[PDB]
Design a protein around this ligand. Sequence first.
Ligand code: ZKM
Ligand code: ZKM
Ligand code: ZKM
Ligand code: ZKM
Ligand code: ZKM
Ligand code: ZKM
Ligand SMILES: *[C@@H]1O[C@H](CO)[C@@H](O[C@@H]2O[C@H](CO)[C@@H](O[C@@H]3O[C@H](CO)[C@@H](O)[C@H](O)[C@H]3NC(C)=O)[C@H](O)[C@H]2NC(C)=O)[C@H](O)[C@H]1NC(C)=O
Ligand SMILES: *[C@@H]1O[C@H](CO)[C@@H](O[C@@H]2O[C@H](CO)[C@@H](O[C@@H]3O[C@H](CO)[C@@H](O)[C@H](O)[C@H]3NC(C)=O)[C@H](O)[C@H]2NC(C)=O)[C@H](O)[C@H]1NC(C)=O
Ligand SMILES: *[C@@H]1O[C@H](CO)[C@@H](O[C@@H]2O[C@H](CO)[C@@H](O)[C@H](O)[C@H]2NC(C)=O)[C@H](O)[C@H]1NC(C)=O
Ligand SMILES: *[C@@H]1O[C@H](CO)[C@@H](O[C@@H]2O[C@H](CO)[C@@H](O)[C@H](O)[C@H]2NC(C)=O)[C@H](O)[C@H]1NC(C)=O
Ligand code: NAG
Ligand code: NAG
Ligand code: NAG
Ligand code: NAG
Ligand code: NAG
Ligand code: NAG
Ligand code: NAG
Ligand code: NAG
Lengths: 136, 136, 590, 590
Amino acid sequence: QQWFCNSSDAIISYSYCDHLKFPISISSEPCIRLRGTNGFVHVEFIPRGNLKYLYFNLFISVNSIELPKRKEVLCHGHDDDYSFCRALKGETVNTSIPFSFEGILFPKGHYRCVAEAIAGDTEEKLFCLNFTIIHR
Amino acid sequence: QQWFCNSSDAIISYSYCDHLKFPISISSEPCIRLRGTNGFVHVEFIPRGNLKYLYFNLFISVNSIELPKRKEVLCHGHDDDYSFCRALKGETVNTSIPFSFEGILFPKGHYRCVAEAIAGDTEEKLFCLNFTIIHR
Amino acid sequence: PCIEVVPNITYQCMDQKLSKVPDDIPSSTKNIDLSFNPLKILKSYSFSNFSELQWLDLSRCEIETIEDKAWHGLHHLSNLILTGNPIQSFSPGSFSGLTSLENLVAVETKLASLESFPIGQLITLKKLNVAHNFIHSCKLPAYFSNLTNLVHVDLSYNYIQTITVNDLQFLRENPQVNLSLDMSLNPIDFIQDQAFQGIKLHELTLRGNFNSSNIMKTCLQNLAGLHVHRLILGEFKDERNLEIFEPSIMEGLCDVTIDEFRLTYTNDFSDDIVKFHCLANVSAMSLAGVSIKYLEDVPKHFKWQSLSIIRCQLKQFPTLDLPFLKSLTLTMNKGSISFKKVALPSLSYLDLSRNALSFSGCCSYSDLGTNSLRHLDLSFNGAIIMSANFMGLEELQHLDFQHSTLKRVTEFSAFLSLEKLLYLDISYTNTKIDFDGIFLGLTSLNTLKMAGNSFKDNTLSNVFANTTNLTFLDLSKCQLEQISWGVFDTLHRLQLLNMSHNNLLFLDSSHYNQLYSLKELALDTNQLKSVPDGIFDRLTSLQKIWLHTNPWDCSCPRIDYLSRWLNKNSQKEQGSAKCSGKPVRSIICP
Amino acid sequence: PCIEVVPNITYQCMDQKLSKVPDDIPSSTKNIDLSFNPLKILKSYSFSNFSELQWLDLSRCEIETIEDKAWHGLHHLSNLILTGNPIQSFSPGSFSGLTSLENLVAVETKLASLESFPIGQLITLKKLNVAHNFIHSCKLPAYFSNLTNLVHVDLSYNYIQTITVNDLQFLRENPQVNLSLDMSLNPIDFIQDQAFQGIKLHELTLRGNFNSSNIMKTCLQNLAGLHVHRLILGEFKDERNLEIFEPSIMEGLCDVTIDEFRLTYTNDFSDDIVKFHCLANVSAMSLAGVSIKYLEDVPKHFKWQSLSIIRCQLKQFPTLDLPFLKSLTLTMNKGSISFKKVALPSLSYLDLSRNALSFSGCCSYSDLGTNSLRHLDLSFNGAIIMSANFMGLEELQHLDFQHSTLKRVTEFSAFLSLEKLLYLDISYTNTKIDFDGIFLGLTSLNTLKMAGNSFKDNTLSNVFANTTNLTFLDLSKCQLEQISWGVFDTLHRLQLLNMSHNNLLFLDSSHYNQLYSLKELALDTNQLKSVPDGIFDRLTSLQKIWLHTNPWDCSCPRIDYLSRWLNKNSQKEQGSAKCSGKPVRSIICP
Ligand SMILES: CCCCCCCCCCCCC/C=C/[C@@H](O)[C@H](CO[C@@H]1O[C@H](CO)[C@H](O)[C@H](OS(=O)(=O)O)[C@H]1O)NC(=O)CCCCCCCCCCCCCCC
Ligand SMILES: CCCCCCCCCCCCC/C=C/[C@@H](O)[C@H](CO[C@@H]1O[C@H](CO)[C@H](O)[C@H](OS(=O)(=O)O)[C@H]1O)NC(=O)CCCCCCCCCCCCCCC
Ligand SMILES: CCCCCCCCCCCCC/C=C/[C@@H](O)[C@H](CO[C@@H]1O[C@H](CO)[C@H](O)[C@H](OS(=O)(=O)O)[C@H]1O)NC(=O)CCCCCCCCCCCCCCC
Ligand SMILES: CCCCCCCCCCCCC/C=C/[C@@H](O)[C@H](CO[C@@H]1O[C@H](CO)[C@H](O)[C@H](OS(=O)(=O)O)[C@H]1O)NC(=O)CCCCCCCCCCCCCCC
Ligand SMILES: CCCCCCCCCCCCC/C=C/[C@@H](O)[C@H](CO[C@@H]1O[C@H](CO)[C@H](O)[C@H](OS(=O)(=O)O)[C@H]1O)NC(=O)CCCCCCCCCCCCCCC
Ligand SMILES: CCCCCCCCCCCCC/C=C/[C@@H](O)[C@H](CO[C@@H]1O[C@H](CO)[C@H](O)[C@H](OS(=O)(=O)O)[C@H]1O)NC(=O)CCCCCCCCCCCCCCC
Ligand SMILES: *[C@@H]1O[C@H](CO)[C@@H](O[C@@H]2O[C@H](CO)[C@@H](O[C@@H]3O[C@H](CO)[C@@H](O)[C@H](O)[C@H]3NC(C)=O)[C@H](O)[C@H]2NC(C)=O)[C@H](O)[C@H]1NC(C)=O
Ligand SMILES: *[C@@H]1O[C@H](CO)[C@@H](O[C@@H]2O[C@H](CO)[C@@H](O[C@@H]3O[C@H](CO)[C@@H](O)[C@H](O)[C@H]3NC(C)=O)[C@H](O)[C@H]2NC(C)=O)[C@H](O)[C@H]1NC(C)=O
Ligand SMILES: *[C@@H]1O[C@H](CO)[C@@H](O[C@@H]2O[C@H](CO)[C@@H](O)[C@H](O)[C@H]2NC(C)=O)[C@H](O)[C@H]1NC(C)=O
Ligand SMILES: *[C@@H]1O[C@H](CO)[C@@H](O[C@@H]2O[C@H](CO)[C@@H](O)[C@H](O)[C@H]2NC(C)=O)[C@H](O)[C@H]1NC(C)=O
Ligand SMILES: *[C@@H]1O[C@H](CO)[C@@H](O)[C@H](O)[C@H]1NC(C)=O
Ligand SMILES: *[C@@H]1O[C@H](CO)[C@@H](O)[C@H](O)[C@H]1NC(C)=O
Ligand SMILES: *[C@@H]1O[C@H](CO)[C@@H](O)[C@H](O)[C@H]1NC(C)=O
Ligand SMILES: *[C@@H]1O[C@H](CO)[C@@H](O)[C@H](O)[C@H]1NC(C)=O
Ligand SMILES: *[C@@H]1O[C@H](CO)[C@@H](O)[C@H](O)[C@H]1NC(C)=O
Ligand SMILES: *[C@@H]1O[C@H](CO)[C@@H](O)[C@H](O)[C@H]1NC(C)=O
Ligand SMILES: *[C@@H]1O[C@H](CO)[C@@H](O)[C@H](O)[C@H]1NC(C)=O
Ligand SMILES: *[C@@H]1O[C@H](CO)[C@@H](O)[C@H](O)[C@H]1NC(C)=O
């Protein structure tokens, strides 16, 4: 809907969540191969809050079987690894984030992952993406 | 009753347990100083079972406050550290065991410790000593 | 159209398609968020009714024009945020009327230079953020002498390529000024010879400035003469990084006096970088997100008084004998390391939390080589095997084991030496309390957090006899089913007692007759069906009680005491104890 | 006077002040313990009625005289224990009649030599223990050629000071004999030149023989020519020990062919001892109770096919790249070590239990460098952080995490690769199951031990959908309160289901309609008060059920099905389900 790509073992797409539509352009280069991928996550958006304490809530499901909520902190508030942790509310963010992963066996089937970005100082929701990953 | 000694901070004595009176001569040289001691435990007795899997059950109390049972294995049955692990039922055992400990703060007062020697292959009780330690 | 957040005080007008500031906003408002509205122009006198306004957010408001009296009436405004507005040209007097301004955020306003920026009369200004603009000069303007309170300037993410002698003239003239400069994400490739002679700075941040090792090495050399309290260096993962990072890149740092050195992420790294001789006179050394694998053989003439290793990648616990080291933080390390004995005779603060650390032989003097330890954090780790009760460490005031796997802590008085301990957290350590003497010696203890554990036979035993000065006791989620007699008769100063989320089947009236100081009692979420008559009668200090989520038996005359008590003391009850649905407080027996 | 232990089979007559063997002992007895009785003399024909006797213990019986027909009638006796009896002189024919004897224990009988020991016609003898006597010669007598089945001789704790060429003549003559010699605690100070040429031994134990380094080094050299399957060396803590233990003490071992080398406790030790070049061709290396601190840089030309490190003192996990190593045991290590990656391409067996070990990144091929792993024991350790689901290790058959702190095992399918796994133990790992897919891929799993954990909302969820071949499921002490629908409909081959010591409030009749193979069902020690009618009707294979320690409601017609069922199937019930005291099986509704 909002974006999608084809991997050799994965079909990945996302929309905005039904409850939050704050805009953001995310993509990966190349498309993510669940067997393993080295690439970049390109992000361009204008955040609705400071990113000094940005973290994510990930609600993942495999074939309608839900995993516990996981929290992934990206900016801890002190000497953070990423240049966008400095970004303020209303500031244009344009960055490419390198990533590299490998060697986890994923079960085949239909994954859902709503990714909820939170400004950790105010606990306010920055945006929410509804992901769909079809493995195989 | 059966033996006792005076330390600079401890008075140590033992009798046989009321339920098991299999004889054994135990002493330490010097008397145990709970602040710290290097010495020998002299043991001379004729065991009522093989010592190949000898372990101890220790029931300790401080001022009538009971600690959980602790199990101290002396002979594991394979390449054991002590020459008496080879001893058989009915064989004269005569040994001096070096020991060295230090730097644990013990609360003052009245300790009881019944020490129950068990032959771990047969689970039979080899002997039982009722210890009394008065710290300070 | 504005979300009322705190009545007549705080209003959230963000993203409401507002063309102008609403006149409906009450005059006593202190905080207004107008961001993400197409304001386009700040008209004169628009905020003149908000005499008590302190914080005003106009981020992403498409503002091109600030009219000549746009901020008339804002005598008390201390925070003004203009991020993302394409103002570009700030005409003279653009900030007239902002007589209490302390924090000006002009990020991404297409600002081209500070010389033309009309802030020379904001004599109250403390912080200036002009990141993400078109500034290409490092010149600190002369009007900074009017801004006697300015302590921080953010120049991050601009186009500064050069730092000249004259650029820092103002600071050379004024050595009394305390100023911090954030230069991150500027394409600096030239620093003039001796530009930093006679220059003093509090905090200097140089992150993500350099693409090439040779350019970074050449520029660091011309920091010579500089005196900084805190120098922050490093790169970002999402920016083009240095090809190689050798220690000799920082050879220039020898001609700089540095009190505190912070190193952040670098693409390349070598363990020798932390042992670089130009860092020898630093008093606070810090590593965050750095690929250090081994920290060993730090020369004893190093003067580090605090060391901080955060989110790093140590394969093996450091070997350290720094005699002047007072604080050590090794936290959030990538991997699992085992503790190794250190010799830090000046050590008074130790944070080893979140390392999946395995500690064999906790704890005594020989592990640490110090008699001055006051703070010890071993939380969020692996196996911590208790084998000594802190001989040599009786100065310890704070002890945290939260979420580590405490082993053998109940087989002796593991804390007997800690007669000055104020704070103990053994929550969620999977400890099964089976020794009444577990807390012997803890006579100074005020805060005891031990939630998520359990007790032998699920009975709360007499473990609090010596903890006579407890003021905070958290026993939640301890699978408790009953309480032994006299467990609380000593805690005359206890102010909080949390026993929620247990399996209590009955209470006894005797346990609460000596909680003279008890203010808060949490008993919700148990299996309680009744209380003895008068159990709450002597709780003369009580202010809050939780009793909900219990299967209360509301039959008369059984529920009589509780219903009448909950009614008379309805201001104290938090939540609603409801009958197995009517609140127990709403039941009148005959 | 004899304690009857197993009727007409086993009798315990120890320490009953018996003067002679009791004639009351039944003739079919197979095991008699007569120890610690003042027998003083074994009279002729005393045991002639015990034709089926196999094991006879006469330890500490003060026996001085064995009469010339003392063992008449004992044609089937295989074990005879004479420990502690001052027999001293064994006259000719002293063991006549013991025609099936396999194990002769003559420990501490004041025996002076084997040459005069009349055992030359015990052609069935397999084991000979003559420890703790007055033997001063190492001469293996010539009649050993009659004893074709003798495989073990215990000479420990005697007075042997010398080993000569002629002492081992018998073994030199007979290279086909498989014989093991225990020489421990003999004051050996001289081995003749070439005494061990042409000598083959299965197991040779030399523990606690030497007081001086020079005497041990001199004696080890003259083991030259010896071929031993298993050589055991070391000292005892409770005996006078070697002053220093350098590797060169074992220079003589280069002239010995050793298949397996065992080193035990030594007072002195140096890490180089395990890297000694004379151990290069050993195929099984073992260390037990040894003060080794670092095991590093083992030359790759070492041929060790198994390494065993038990009760040692490693400060740091070994670095090992032995390409022929098939089995590695590092267990009960003193301290806490962190796992370090190894490169063992032949590794098929790995036991790392009881180390308080912390493992960051379990588990995949890169941790171990092998595709042939079948056995992995990580139990009784610290923090084991699950981050990979065993890619590269799909040959794994046995996996044990018992009592370790498993972390993040429920955040993905941590075992998806393990399609050949037969045995999984995650008991007492403080795992809170919150993912129904936790056991995806475990289609070969037969044994699942997961006691002592818990589930989200205390509900047993649908985690067994893929484990179609489970035969053993242990869910005890999991704080379960209820079971989701259909959790067991797949387990047609399950034979045991243990759900005892939970908090089950009700059962559903649907959960047990497809347990076709279920033999044993443990439901004791819950909160059960009733069962649905017919819940046990389709358990056609049931043989044992535990239902006691439950507050059963014995009111009619509610308890009708259960009481009638427990009565009709009373042979299957283990223990007694008693009413909230009469057994439920003893209740007849109208
Ligand atoms: C502003 C809005 C943001 C919107 C997009 C969010 C950003 C997406 C990517 C962010 C993290 C990726 C960088 C990964 C680095 C690791 O690759 C790298 C770890 O990997 C290891 O690192 C080692 C050295 O570091 C070795 O290299 C290892 O290799 S080994 O073989 O030698 O041993 C290698 O495994 N580092 C990390 O911090 C890991 C933490 C990253 C996870 C946290 C966030 C994950 C996703 C965030 C939310 C998901 C939703 C996305 C769309 C909404
Ligand atoms: C046949 C019947 C027996 C009747 C009597 C029973 C024997 C009594 C003594 C047996 C063990 C003593 C040897 C101690 C060695 C440690 O001292 C020594 C450990 O200590 C450390 O060891 C390191 C190197 O090893 C360093 O040296 C350390 O120092 S550091 O500073 O460098 O780091 C040092 O701390 N080793 C051990 O195995 C410890 C295990 C011993 C406890 C198990 C049994 C304890 C008592 C048994 C029952 C009690 C009842 C007694 C009367 C009935
Ligand atoms: C006549 C009566 C017979 C009496 C015989 C009684 C036995 C004597 C005790 C033997 C010592 C036990 C081993 C402890 C060594 C410590 O020194 C030990 C060293 O343990 C360290 O803790 C970690 C885990 O173990 C690491 O493993 C360390 O290793 S590391 O290098 O990696 O860091 C290791 O060092 N510290 C301790 O606090 C342990 C407890 C001290 C024992 C105190 C016992 C007092 C006995 C009182 C006698 C009264 C009569 C008894 C009646 C039954
Ligand atoms: C006051 C007089 C009464 C005293 C009674 C005298 C009895 C002697 C006690 C012996 C204690 C030392 C045993 C440790 C051996 C290490 O060696 C042992 C190493 O750990 C195990 O050592 C085994 C050796 O091989 C295996 O390696 C095990 O592997 S395992 O998985 O099979 O279990 C391994 O873990 N260290 C520890 O545990 C931690 C240190 C011991 C803590 C003991 C504290 C004090 C105990 C005395 C009780 C008095 C309390 C008074 C109330 C306040
Ligand atoms: C356009 C959409 C944007 C997509 C962005 C999504 C982010 C991409 C993932 C970033 C990698 C995370 C870091 C993991 C590194 C591993 O390589 C990591 C290395 O972890 C090791 O495990 C230990 C503890 O961490 C030690 O710390 C090791 O260290 S050691 O040296 O001491 O032994 C360390 O190496 N192995 C793993 O199995 C972890 C999990 C693998 C991550 C797979 C994620 C798949 C993402 C699928 C994307 C679909 C779209 C997403 C929708 C929201
Ligand atoms: C299929 C498409 C859906 C996928 C969704 C994409 C989302 C991206 C997931 C990111 C995972 C990697 C994050 C780890 C970073 C390390 O860095 C991290 C190091 O550990 C923490 O790392 C922090 C960095 O600073 C702090 O150091 C923490 O300190 S703390 O105490 O504050 O917490 C420290 O412990 N390794 C781990 O945890 C263990 C390895 C991660 C296991 C993840 C397994 C696979 C997850 C994907 C879910 C799919 C399941 C499918 C069902 C079968
Ligand atoms: C080291 O870091 C520098 C960033 O600070 C890089 O140089 C900058 O590269 C930008 C492109 O990546 C340039 O942008 C463009 O600017 C020119 C004007 O000079 C315009 O005509 C172009 O249109 C514009 N780009 C686009 C897409 O329109 C910056 O001007 C340039 N700045 C400087 C000071 O050089 C280096 O490339 C970088 N080195 C490496 C190896 O990454
Ligand atoms: C190295 O180990 C040897 C043990 O195998 C020690 O030597 C033995 O010492 C015993 C005493 O400790 C001697 O016992 C005595 O034997 C003599 C006869 O030789 C009797 O007269 C004595 O009465 C008797 N002792 C008593 C108390 O009655 C052993 O004879 C002797 N054996 C040998 C072969 O020498 C060494 O002492 C020991 N070295 C060290 C430094 O410990
Ligand atoms: C120089 O100015 C800064 C203004 O921020 C002062 O800094 C802070 O000190 C307090 C207490 O020591 C800390 O809580 C802050 O976190 C510090 N902030 C920064 C940015 O360092 C500094 O103390 C001043 N120096 C003086 C007045 O001598
Ligand atoms: C030599 O004799 C011994 C007799 O004990 C044999 O030893 C055993 O082998 C079995 C199986 O391999 C093990 O279970 C025992 O533990 C071994 N015992 C000992 C003492 O090693 C040995 O196999 C024989 N060698 C032959 C017959 O070739
Ligand atoms: C995610 O998308 C699915 C499918 O369109 C939808 O059913 C679900 O409600 C969405 N979840 C959100 C928006 O949180
Ligand atoms: C943001 O960066 C991307 C490059 O990945 C590209 O679209 C362009 O350079 C930027 N977009 C802008 C400035 O609108
Ligand atoms: C140990 O001795 C005490 C005091 O004499 C006695 O009360 C107790 O019963 C004894 N315990 C035994 C023998 O187990
Ligand atoms: C046992 O050894 C002790 C020495 O500690 C001493 O009584 C004597 O040597 C031996 N006792 C005997 C042999 O009765
Ligand atoms: C601590 O407990 C002991 C009991 O052994 C008691 O004698 C002492 O007075 C108590 N002191 C304090 C301050 O709790
Ligand atoms: C009691 O403990 C619960 C469980 O963690 C917690 O949520 C609650 O805030 C506590 N009550 C207090 C602190 O009053
Ligand atoms: C395992 O579970 C999957 C569900 O994702 C199913 O398709 C597959 O047939 C199952 N196989 C076995 C052997 O349990
Ligand atoms: C069920 O689990 C309990 C608790 O450990 C155990 O005692 C019992 O033997 C088990 N029942 C079996 C194995 O039948």
